[PDB]
Structure formats: structure tokens, C-alpha cells
Design a protein around this ligand. Sequence first.
Ligand SMILES: CCO[C@@H](Cc1ccc(OCCn2c(C)ccc2-c2ccc(SC)cc2)cc1)C(=O)O
Length: 256
Amino acid sequence: TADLKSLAKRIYEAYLKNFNMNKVKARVILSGPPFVIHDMETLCMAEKTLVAKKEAEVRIFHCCQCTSVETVTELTEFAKAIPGFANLDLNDQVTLLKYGVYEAIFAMLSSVMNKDGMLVAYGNGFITREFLKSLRKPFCDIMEPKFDFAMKFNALELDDSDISLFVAAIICCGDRPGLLNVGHIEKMQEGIVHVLRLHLQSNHPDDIFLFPKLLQKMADLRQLVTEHAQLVQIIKKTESDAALHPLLQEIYRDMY
Ligand SMILES: CCO[C@@H](Cc1ccc(OCCn2c(C)ccc2-c2ccc(SC)cc2)cc1)C(=O)O
């Protein structure tokens, strides 16, 4: 229905407008120039670009943090384009966002990642996968699971129009803890998922099973976030130099 066809465009619109990075321009950059960070020297050079006059692992740990806070803010504004979200109870908007933020972060970060590294610093830097592996434990275990997910997720060849609805569906999960009006959210969820399923059919006629694959990726993302939140706790509890942004701690607070 043209209403359905227009609903996807709505969400695709709010997506291109609230997220400073997207797959189309990330690929425009990844092709061909981002400053390559591939060893300790190039990391320190790139840092001096910002603070002219703690420990490499800990500085990286806070840079990623800065990207999460930004995306939390962007996701909230994006959520408005979903039919019914703004009509939901406030406490339920907070709960859906609290549990869907990191799932959406790691989903969208794939657009910026390839087998060799990922775009960082607003498209100005490119940090290598091998360098991230070379970091001392346990900071070297942060990103490699995100690359494994991203490599298989990107193999699905989704575009920003698909990821648009995928991220909306992520936020629209009816089985999040502490939801008051679970009934309305599931109806909200059913509407987003419906238009996602049909959009995938029309946009990817060469892969009719793309929708079941994305449902599986949704569950993979959930497990990916649970494990990531755990590793953050280990770093926070240990590594006495590793602070945790307070807005991010409130997201993890009572999550998994
Ligand atoms: C361990 C923290 O985990 C976060 C979740 C999370 C994990 C990886 C991520 O990729 C950010 C990109 N990147 C990496 C991989 C190293 C350094 C940067 C970087 C360099 C310069 C800048 S300039 C602002 C920004 C980022 C983004 C968020 C959380 O829990 O919030």
C-alpha cells in the first residue's frame, strides 16, 4: 500500500538526517583520504591532532565511548519517525531506547567497517583491524567480535533503505523488560516489521530469505550486546584508569 511504501521512505528519511554517518558515504570514503591508524605511532599522531600539548588502550576505550553517546542522542531523534513511538508512554520510550541503543550501534557500525578496519573520527580516520587485535588484553577483545558480525552482516548487501527499517525494528522490540503497555508496542513493532518484510522483498528480489536472515541477525546482535556489556564491566571494575561516561552507565544500569 502506498501508505506502506511511504512509511519506509519516512523512516529512511529520518535515518539519513539524524545519523552523521551512513553506508553510502562510508563506502564513498572507503573507496577513494582517511588517516590510517595502524600502530602506536599513528595512533599518537592522530591523538595529537586533537589535544596538542593515560595509556593507548584506555584512550581508545574513551573514544568509542564518545561515539556511543553521540549515537544515543541521534537514535532518540530517529525514533520519532516510527508510527506510534512518540504516542507511547514516556517510560516505555526510555526502556525501548535503553535496550535497543547498543544493538543499533553495532548494526550501523558495520556500514563503516570492512575486513581491514573501520572508519572513525567522522570519516577522518581509519583504524586497522589488526592494530585493534594487537592491543593488550582485554582491550583487544572489544572489537574483533564486532568485525565477525559486520563481515557476515555486510555480506547481506543491505543499503541505507534496509538498515533504516532494520534499526527501527530493533527499537520496536515488544519483549524488552519493564514495558508497561506491551500491547501497543507489539502493534507498533508489527507495523515496522511488516513494512520491513515487504521492503526487503521489493528491494532484494534475488534473496527472498533476507527477512529470516535479518531476524537471526537481530538475535545475534542481542547476544553481541550482552557479551560486550560484560566486557565493559570487566574493564570498568578492573583497569582503574578506565572511566565510564555517566549517560552510558545509566544505559547499562539494570540492563543485562
Ligand atoms: C568499549 C566502548 O564500547 C562502546 C561501544 C562502541 C565500540 C566501538 C566503536 O567504534 C568507534 C571507532 N573506534 C574504535 C573501534 C577505536 C577507536 C575508535 C574511535 C576513534 C576516534 C573517534 S572521534 C569521536 C571515535 C571512535 C564505537 C562504540 C560503548 O560501550 O559505548
